[PDB]
Design a binder for this molecule. Structure first.
Ligand SMILES: CCCCCCCCCCCCCC(=O)OC[C@H](COP(=O)([O-])O)OC(=O)CCCCCCCCCCCCC
Ligand SMILES: CCCCCCCC/C=C/CCCCCCCC(=O)OC[C@H](O)CO
Ligand SMILES: CCCCCCCC/C=C\CCCCCCCC(=O)OC[C@H](O)CO
Ligand SMILES: CCCCCCCC/C=C\CCCCCCCC(=O)OC[C@H](O)CO
Ligand SMILES: CCCCCCCC/C=C\CCCCCCCC(=O)OC[C@H](O)CO
Ligand SMILES: CCCCCCCC/C=C\CCCCCCCC(=O)OC[C@H](O)CO
Ligand SMILES: CCCCCCCC/C=C\CCCCCCCC(=O)OC[C@H](O)CO
Ligand SMILES: CCCCCCCCCCCCCCCCCC
Ligand SMILES: CCCCCCCCCCCCCCCCCC
Ligand SMILES: CCCCCCCCCCCCCCCCCC
Ligand SMILES: CCCCCCCCCCCCCCCCCC
Ligand SMILES: CCCCCCCCCCCCCCCCCC
Ligand SMILES: CCCCCCCCCCCCCCCCCC
Ligand code: NA
Ligand code: NA
Ligand code: NA
Ligand code: NA
Ligand code: NA
Ligand code: NA
Ligand code: NA
Lengths: 337, 335
């Protein structure tokens, strides 16, 4: 049903980390559900999908999801094409002319794949990238990049997007949470936290960000977390009138601020301060899911808000210790000044 | 290589200002480029220079430069000997006679250094002289630091103790409405946490970890102060507008410090602002204390201090950000 036509190249005969690039790309495409056909002159068997790979490439993605009609790209180089079966009606023997005709007749999008075009002079980089791949950031890039392109094209800048997302998140948190609309507040806050995350991709498309932009993005993270926790606290203290839960919420707020501060300050002194069980994404998911479940339409479970807040509280205290341990074990930490 | 042979003594195990005299003289001589070897009977390893210290001594000089053949002295007392490697050819097992022979065979000059020969009955004077060497503040802060070091405390321990005591004061006294005693306790133990700097100066000089810990504990103390105040304001006073002002103060106090830390982590500046941590603490603590002052408390001091602080904090939040924006290299593109 799915055929992957790979053009034979000289470098696919080279070995890399025990296996040849030929078998490597073959198994990679087979994992993606493709039947692999190497070729020198293209003969289009009847299929529903065609993945045609013309340049020699090492694919660095484990899970490859291809749909629609796309041009696969990698660092600006056009790796291959993902066409429908209808391309057989346009393929007239001359591959370049058929490809150009098909691109003129159809709507195609670009598909940024984590891969590297193989040449005689970059195989060491291919080895390094394969090791990096073996340890989804690639799927994150493949989703964020078109949105970043669109936002840049309508005149937005990465820092502007940071401020927009942070302002919308604080507005949602401080408006919807105090009046008890925990589920729509959780949705709005999550949407605009994801929105604020786009500034990095936008700066990558501008061939570079700035240090001020990074500092602004992080300080805005702190502002947004403070606002989420403050709006939840307002609801818990004055809506629910729950003193124990206020204790948990104040603990969550202060500890999340200090957890981020430890990493920042350790790096300011030239040390490490990262780590911990609960970082910002897990922290936001636990509190927002707890708030959303507590106000879910029709079948809300109100105890989800306290359970999330208490678990996070303990999970934050522990993290605060863990990061301190990181600072304590960083080289030069106990060095005398 | 140059070897410093120090004769072992019981008194080198005594601690002065947190560190032992053995470790103190060891680090001092290592700063001078010597490999330090403690001994009771001398075995001369091969070296280019020999620094022989026989009496127990505290060296009070930071920069010691030894080049020729010399006799180190201090106020008439012979501190040590600086001989060449050729002393290995004259050492016959008995150190005093070999030293006298080497002195008879060579011409040496007396190098007057700043040191003190240690005895059991002058350790207090030696500690006072060491304190003079390492550095009101002098009458109150330094003796308190010396006392805290003497009972085995270290700077990081005092940081944690002072922060824990201030957090306890804030979280016990403020929520039940005891704003004046809470302000007193918090101020006292913030000063206590500040004693960590003097203790580090008296010891090695402090660590990067210590600096990071002191600052993170500052953040914890500020969070606890504002949280106890918020508890009282929300459930004791039932004043919601003042609660928004207090939440603004809390969040902004965390974020203001985070900006500076994060900018410095990026190699930029982030300090400044109209209201810094000492001013913030003075404002909120004075407002709470005046609001709960004994006999004739003035209730409006708490809200005025908070709202000012809120307005003063938000502005500060911008200023530091502007500082980051104007730091050299801030807006440079990173390829
Ligand atoms: C500084 C931001 C303040 C602007 C807040 C905007 C809220 C608009 C009102 C939205 C509808 C909420 C209705 C409601 O039930 O609560 C009203 C409440 C104020 O009313 P009152 O009870 O104080 O009279 O409303 C509130 O109390 C809002 C609670 C949020 C207060 C916490 C502010 C913390 C700021 C976070 C960091 C700031 C960035 C520098
Ligand atoms: C610009 C700001 C202008 C503000 C103008 C004043 C507004 C009204 C003041 C209310 C404070 C509450 C008054 C009564 C509560 C006293 C607060 C307090 O500290 O109480 C301690 C004591 O334990 C309690 O019994
Ligand atoms: C470890 C320390 C505390 C863990 C959690 C101990 C607290 C358990 C909270 C149970 C509870 O009462 O919930 C709080 C709130 O009142 C619900 O609405
Ligand atoms: C930009 C869009 C981002 C977020 C929108 C999220 C939309 C949230 C829609 C919620 C609809 C609603 O009113 O739900 C109330 C809920 O049932 C009470 O518990
Ligand atoms: C006041 C309560 C009304 C609650 C309104 C329902 C929406 C609030 C969501 C919530 O967390 O309810 C918790 C519940 O009051 C305890 O656990
Ligand atoms: C580390 C920073 C995060 C820690 C955050 C912890 C905040 C909660 C701590 C103590 C509250 C103690 C409550 C003491 C009793 C309440 C007094 C009260 O307000 O009672 C009002 C009364 O019911 C009608 O006027
Ligand atoms: C910018 C707005 C600054 C507004 C600051 C002045 C408002 C002070 C205030 O409203 O205090 C009420 C008091 O806390 C209880 O009655
Ligand atoms: C509400 C949509 C705003 C989109 C940004 C456009 C930036 C340039 C405006 C002219
Ligand atoms: C309330 C303010 C809402 C503003 C809407 C966001 C539009 C911003 C577009 C331009 C910002 C700078 C981009 C360069
Ligand atoms: C309720 C406010 C919450 C968010 C505060 C954001 C603060 C942003 C500070 C200004 C940064 C300047 C950025 C310049 C580029 C924008 C175009
Ligand atoms: C897992 C899904 C639970 C639903 C919670 C709805 C509130 C939205 C929270 C966003 C975090 C994923
Ligand atoms: C910690 C877990 C506590 C949850 C209590 C549920 C009942 C209160 C709404
Ligand atoms: C009650 C707060 C105590 C804070 C201690 C900070 C150091 C962690 C070990
Ligand atoms: Na951002
Ligand atoms: Na920027
Ligand atoms: Na951000
Ligand atoms: Na209650
Ligand atoms: Na301290
Ligand atoms: Na230290
Ligand atoms: Na401190």
């Amino acid at each position: 049903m799915r055929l992957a036509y790979v053009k034979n190249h000289e470098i696919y005969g080279e070995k890399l980390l025990g296996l040849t690039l030929r078998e490597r790309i073959e198994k990679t495409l087979q994992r993606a559900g493709f039947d692999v056909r190497f070729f020198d002159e293209l003969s289009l068997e009847e299929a529903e999908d065609y993945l045609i790979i013309l340049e020699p490439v090492l694919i660095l993605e484990r899970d490859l999801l291809l749909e629609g009609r796309k041009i696969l790209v990698s660092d600006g180089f056009t790796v291959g094409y993902f066409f429908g079966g209808d391309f057989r009606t346009v393929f007239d023997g001359n591959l370049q002319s058929s490809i150009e005709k098909y691109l003129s007749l159809n709507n195609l999008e670009s598909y940024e794949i984590w891969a590297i075009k193989l040449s005689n002079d970059n195989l060491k980089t291919a080895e390094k990238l394969l090791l990096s791949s073996l340890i989804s950031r690639a799927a994150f890039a493949r989703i964020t990049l078109p949105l970043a392109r669109a936002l840049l094209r309508i005149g937005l800048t990465p820092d502007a997007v940071t401020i927009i997302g942070t302002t919308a998140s604080v507005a949602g948190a401080l408006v919807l949470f105090p009046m008890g609309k925990l589920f729509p507040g959780a949705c709005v806050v999550w949407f605009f936290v994801l929105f604020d995350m786009l500034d990095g991709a936008m700066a990558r498309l501008r061939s570079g960000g700035t240090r001020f932009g990074a500092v602004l993005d992080a300080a805005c993270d702190r502002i947004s977390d403070g606002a989420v926790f403050s709006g939840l606290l307002w609801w818990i203290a004055f809506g629910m009138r729950d003193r124990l839960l206020v204790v948990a919420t104040l603990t969550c707020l202060v500890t999340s601020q200090v957890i981020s501060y430890i990493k920042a300050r350790a790096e300011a002194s030239g040390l490490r301060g990262d780590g911990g069980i609960i970082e910002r994404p897990e922290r936001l998911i636990i509190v927002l899911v707890g708030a959303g479940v507590s106000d879910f339409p029709f079948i809300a479970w109100p105890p989800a808000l306290p359970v999330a807040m208490w678990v996070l509280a303990v999970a934050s205290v522990i993290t605060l210790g863990q990061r301190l341990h990181t600072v304590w074990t960083s080289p030069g930490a106990t060095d005398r000044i």
